[PDB]
Design a protein around this ligand. Structure first.
Ligand SMILES: Cc1cc(CO)c2cccc(Cc3ccccc3C(=O)N3CC[C@@H](N)C3)c2n1
Lengths: 156, 39
C-alpha cells in the first residue's frame, strides 16, 4: 500500500457514496489518527491492509503498523497551522494562536477552528513542520462554536 | 470497510489564512475521552 509520509483521508463505502469519516498522518511507516474515526477497525491502502498496533479511547488516539511516532509539542507561545482536510475539499493550512484547556491533570493547547466532523484527525503543525497533535476531540462553547484540543500521544 | 487516500505534504505554508481566537477554558476529561466545560 501507499506508505509515503503525508496527510491522508479516511474514507468508508459502508454508507451512501464514498464518505470521509476523518483524516490521519503517515510518518515513519505508521498511520496516526483519532480513535473515534476508525473505532480501531482495519484500513486498506490500495491492496495493502493496515492493522491497529496501539490505541486508547481516553486519549482518543490510534496508530497502525507500529508505535505512535509523533512527539513534537506546542511551545505554549507561537502560532500553529491546522492542515485542515475537509470532506470533498483540498488540503488547506489555517494559521492560529492556540488557546488553553485547563484540566486537573494539566494545561493542553486548544484551537478554535470549526470544520465538519469528517475533518477529525487533521494534523496541527509547528513552524518547523513537525506534527504537534491532531484536531477533532474538544468541546462546544457558549457561542455554539467548536474548540478542539491539540491531542498528542507519547513516543516510546 | 475503510480506506485511505493521500491528501498533501505536511508543510508550514508562509502566508496562509490567519484566523481563530485563543480561549482559556476550564475543562474535564471523562473515561470515555469526552471533554466537557467545568463551570
Ligand atoms: C459534536 C461535534 C461538533 C463539531 C463541530 O461543531 C465537531 C467538529 C469536528 C469534530 C468533532 C468530533 C466528532 C466527529 C465525528 C463524530 C463524533 C464526534 C464527537 O463529537 N466525538 C465522538 C467521540 C468524542 N471523543 C468526540 C465534532 N463534534
Amino acid at each position: 500500500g501507499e506508505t509515503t509520509d503525508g496527510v491522508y483521508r479516511v474514507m468508508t463505502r459502508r454508507l451512501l457514496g464514498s464518505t470521509q469519516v476523518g483524516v490521519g498522518v503517515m510518518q515513519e511507516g505508521v498511520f496516526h489518527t483519532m480513535w473515534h474515526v476508525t473505532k480501531g477497525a482495519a484500513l486498506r491502502s490500495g491492496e495493502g491492509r493496515l492493522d491497529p498496533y496501539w490505541g486508547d479511547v481516553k486519549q482518543d488516539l490510534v496508530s497502525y503498523c507500529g508505535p505512535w511516532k509523533l512527539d513534537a509539542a506546542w511551545d505554549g507561545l507561537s502560532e500553529v497551522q491546522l492542515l485542515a482536510v475537509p470532506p470533498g475539499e483540498r488540503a488547506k493550512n489555517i494559521q492560529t494562536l492556540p488557546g488553553i484547556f485547563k484540566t486537573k491533570d494539566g494545561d493542553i493547547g486548544a484551537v478554535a477552528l470549526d470544520y465538519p466532523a469528517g475533518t477529525s484527525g487533521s494534523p496541527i503543525l509547528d513552524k518547523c513542520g513537525r506534527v504537534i497533535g491532531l484536531y477533532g476531540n474538544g468541546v462546544v462553547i457558549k457561542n455554539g462554536s467548536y474548540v478542539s484540543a491539540i491531542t498528542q500521544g507519547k513516543r516510546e | 470497510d475503510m480506506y485511505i487516500e493521500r491528501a498533501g505534504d505536511i508543510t508550514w505554508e508562509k502566508d496562509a489564512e490567519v484566523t481563530g481566537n485563543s480561549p482559556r477554558l476550564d475543562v474535564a476529561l471523562d473515561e470515555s475521552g469526552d471533554f466537557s466545560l467545568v463551570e
